[model samples]
Target chain A: VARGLEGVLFTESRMCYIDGQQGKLYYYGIPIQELAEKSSFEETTFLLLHGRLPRRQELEEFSAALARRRALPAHLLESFKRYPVSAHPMSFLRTAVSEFGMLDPTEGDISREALYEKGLDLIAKFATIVAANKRLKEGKEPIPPREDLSHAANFLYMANGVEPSPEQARLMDAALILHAEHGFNASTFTAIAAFSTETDLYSAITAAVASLKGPRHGGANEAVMRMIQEIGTPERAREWVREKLAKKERIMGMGHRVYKAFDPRAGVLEKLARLVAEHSKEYQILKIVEEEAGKVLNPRGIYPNVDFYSGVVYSDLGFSLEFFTPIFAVARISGWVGHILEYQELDNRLLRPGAKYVGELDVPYVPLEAR
Target chain B: VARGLEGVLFTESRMCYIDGQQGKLYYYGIPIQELAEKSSFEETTFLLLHGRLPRRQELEEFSAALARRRALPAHLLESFKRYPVSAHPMSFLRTAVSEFGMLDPTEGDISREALYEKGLDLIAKFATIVAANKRLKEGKEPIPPREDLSHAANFLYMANGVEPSPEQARLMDAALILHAEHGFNASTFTAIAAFSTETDLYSAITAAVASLKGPRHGGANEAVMRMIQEIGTPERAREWVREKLAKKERIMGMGHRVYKAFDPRAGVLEKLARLVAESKEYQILKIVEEEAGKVLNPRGIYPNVDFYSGVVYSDLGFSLEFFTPIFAVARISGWVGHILEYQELDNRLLRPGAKYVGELDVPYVPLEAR
Candidate 1:
């Protein structure tokens, strides 16, 4: 009855937690909010690996390391140019990330030192690709990376070719930390699945990104934004929710398969939503949405998922809502690297669960014409 | 504990049987050898779908339908030219197939007729992409589909830009049928998983192809080829197999969790391997592999999975070994359409069982940097 190799073992790692029922988030047992509030994305990344917040000197050194790895290899950028402007940004991102591995000087050796450096390089370059692809899609030349900016600030500045406001940059930083890791999510599982073959991190990340691009997983956030835009106002919300439910359409930000209560991340995002809403009229719609969603779903025990408030925060920061999940990739790269590091430390074969086969036995092939 | 959504769902229709214990194959309720001798790939596709062989008129019509849908959309081909020659062919193919949904006149319409035709178009176009991407990766211009040839023959022709011998085409056809569908394999699950959302066929197929490209699923065939090349000779097979087992490196085609005895598809692939090997020198190496693999894992406890035979056939065809699973994309088009049809007949939400919560709840935060 086991469907597919769904439960198949690949590797075990200490990275993130998925509290499906409570809709909670944790990175290596540290709550997402604590990481988002107290640390930068780089520091949170270090915490995911080293199991503690970075000291002042450690944070400075890690920031410097990130700056050093900001630039992608020339050949990889050349490969990026080869992708057409019309190519799906996800396609370009996935292929470019994989090709980066080929040009990476530190591939194939799975040593901890090597993986740590590769992790930094991946985190930096992933930002570069996201920003670069954004520009390329718009028919504008991509701006090169600026090492002076932190990962969050640099991505916004490069993507827009303008400096981000303090609030905007800080919000992005928190979003990144929040999304950095979740246990055995499809994409992370993809990383484990590919790494099971002892393939390079490039192959692992490529497979992971492919999973992220699907609508059911990381892409759900984008769909959530689209749904909100269609609803437009508080008055329209009830009818809208009713219509979608009647049609069997899933309302993106409502109802989590895991969380019967409230998603913990949603509360973190709600605060960010308020901060952003105060500065921009565009996000006032979010408040109306919050009120309406609470009224409707509270009675039914459904709550706003991470996607609900994330859409408003992302929009307030001047990002196209569709690219929200790619922002997720920027944070998740750290978690993936952390998990991969943990897998190497454990060094065990991941042979998880089995399935019961349901197929015909020893049948003959008959021609179409015969039947 | 049940991990990763295991022990879920019931699937009724399957054409092949795997005696995980015996290591044998039966197609359409008969052994694979009977099918290879008596039937063709087009016939097998029909049988897999309709649960029986097609009549002469039906076969001719179905073959023509497959041929008619084989040509790639002009825009999709144009998109392929945009890919860097160095891009992973699987990624290129997956993205290209998803983009293909944009060109389908029937896409986004989930009506019975639309779904059926889309399935045919998907199978036909998947073959075109596999063949085309293989050529494109090798820096050759992809050949357009030839309407005159059968489905199997056209795939080889487009892939190589030349006619394959009758024997070669037949072997490739059988291989495709053998791989076309299995109950809830990763890629099939991907298709089913996506479809459960009531999404369009294009997205479903795209997701499935992406899943298939992963090493745990469709990429195993290519990995098997890599292992063979590394081992090099028939005599070295024993040492190579032993070392890999000692190291616990999964011998790609050695064992299956579902088939504790033998994989029926392996038997079909073995016969096809012998057929193709007869005209080529690689047959001896393959024979040694069969022997070494069995001797290594005796008690008839372990047998070659589909991946083992896939390598021999791939080498025989002189095709890019990675394209083996892409061929599965062609056959899976039928599976997806059939499922979509099944959905229409019986509509039910496919919510599966899951294990309980594993984490604790805590307070929410209000600031970006707490």
Candidate 2:
């Protein structure tokens, strides 16, 4: 039996690749570090979807197309107010994504053009729904999305109710670009498994959100943020890491199954986090923790993954602790859609795996009254 | 590369087993034929969940727990009216199941007791959601669920707005028992995969509903119904089957992957369909199709699967075309819950698989400005 499907290749994909031993990641042959340093989230998303860099005019139209579809439906936003305030943001996000399928007129139309359009709509509106739900949970009126701003800046503007500086926007954009794609993680695999049945994009995406809600998957960043707060000062950081490891407590976000080397996304996000480190105290403590962690963990080939510094960068951009995974969702929606569209082009087969029967078969039955 | 994951055993299960080569099936070691004949839907569901027959007092308490949660939330029913009339019933069910997660006060509480209670709630309310959507799609007011009736009787009453006879209710119960659990199918596997991430029950069930919406899975029965109508009469069955084969047209519900012998559930459902056969013309046409299909298909060991006669039974019981799969969702909720509960007791590892990197890696990045 293949327990947890470990080491089993699921399918062939041209979308993304990971060289775990080499600490490298690529989206359609473009390195993640290059995209984080030089490309916008919109351009990276376009690259992942179309498998090539868009020219100047193509990028402009693609940006406009995404920006135009960024607004959430009024009814959907209205329904957000009724969600249980105590619900996790991921739970709220999951429900809203399912509702998108019901609200659409052509939900069952799974043609290439239709699936492409729906993918773009979800890529745009995931930010709006998340930002709106955050405000509603806080008992504040939601700030409507602005089509004038880029995807990263508009999300920050909607959540914080203020325009961000260009530096902060670029940091957010770099963070988003770093997370825009990853190769067949649990959440993405869940999306592909659901979509393999040829269901609509919304259903597949809703399933992905549910899978990512697990603490084992997308919820790592929030735990990392809590750890950062627990080790409050830079001077105490090294001792705290030593004590925690000596106590045999797990250091969340420090290891990943695929990345035995330094995570390339962490390499980019650490730089972005330091760019906004001038006044934030969390950055200094986090840096000390990383240095101490490296002295012990690097020889064991364990290093910080993407979530290591992602929460620090997000916290520096004025996000609360709970919004970490929702922001991850906002970025990873591109990868999920890219993989879904790519899987649709191949011969979509029904994915039914077998289960070994270990129980008794056809055992002698007793009548209910006698039993 | 394990395309479609065919023949790969996912995990070990103690809940159900299918002996396809022997044309035998069992739930926790009790033969399915015996369950269909002697047990009620509630008892069968409890059997699958607890891995044995519940005692009389325990059975009474379990049945009452399921019946009490039969009614849908008022707000959920209200939201049903807003769904597009043209949307597939499975879509409505999917969205409604997800909404259940948002509406629950303790959605994140994944304790053993909580998962058990939520499974019971979904088992009861799946009927209400499907029946309510059926009426709303017809622009008729929904019939509220009655706690006084058994699960099968209440579903028929809510959908038809009239109480069914005892014989009809028994037939529905048997049909539900036969479908309560099967070894891991696509939709059940989808639920197990989603729940393996340690998500809530509603999320897992919603994903299962989406997987079942595919035509390759639970949508088979509706096509079988359409083919029944196309045949129209039993006298034309032999020639029609031969002609369709001559034309290279595929027959729906004629074969299954694992069930090389006669499908055990189809055996039970065929008997159930014949019980009410006098007033129905679809039954006669279906029977003739089965006979001729047996003559041609039995030699190849491609006998009728569950969908072959399942649509005929539903048609006899006063169901429309679209409700075939929704009825399936109603019954299979038991199996999904059972398997989810079973998997929760295990290690619950995150199910991530590898993909062959067929594309180029680390190619030099071109400047976008160029």
lDDT of 2 at A271: 82
Q: Which portions of model 2 miss their true places by more than 4 Å? A: B226-251, B254-257, B277-306, B309-313, B316-345, B362-370
The second chain of candidate 2 has a TM-score of 0.89
The candidate 2 chain A region of ten consecutive residues with least summed lDDT is A345-354
Clashes per candidate (backbone, < 3 Å): 29, 0
- Please give the C-alpha DockQ score of model 2: 0.59
lDDT of 1 by residue, A74-101 (tens): 7666556646566556556665675565
lDDT of 2 by residue, A325-354 (tens): 889999999999888888887536677776
Error of 2 at B268 (Å): 2.1
All candidates' chain B TM-scores are 0.86, 0.89
lDDT, candidate 1, B30-77, per-residue tens: 665566566666766666666556788988898888789889877778
Global CA lDDT computed for model 1: 0.64
Best by lDDT: 2
Please give, for residues B1-370, the per-residue lDDT of candidate 2 as tens digits: 8887777786888877877677788888989899889888889888877777888888889889889998888878777766666677787888888887888988866777887778888888887777787777778888888888888888778877778788777777777787777777767777777777777788777877777676556656665666666777766666777777778766655665567677888787766666656423445446545665666466544534444455545643444445444555455555455545555645364455556454665453465544
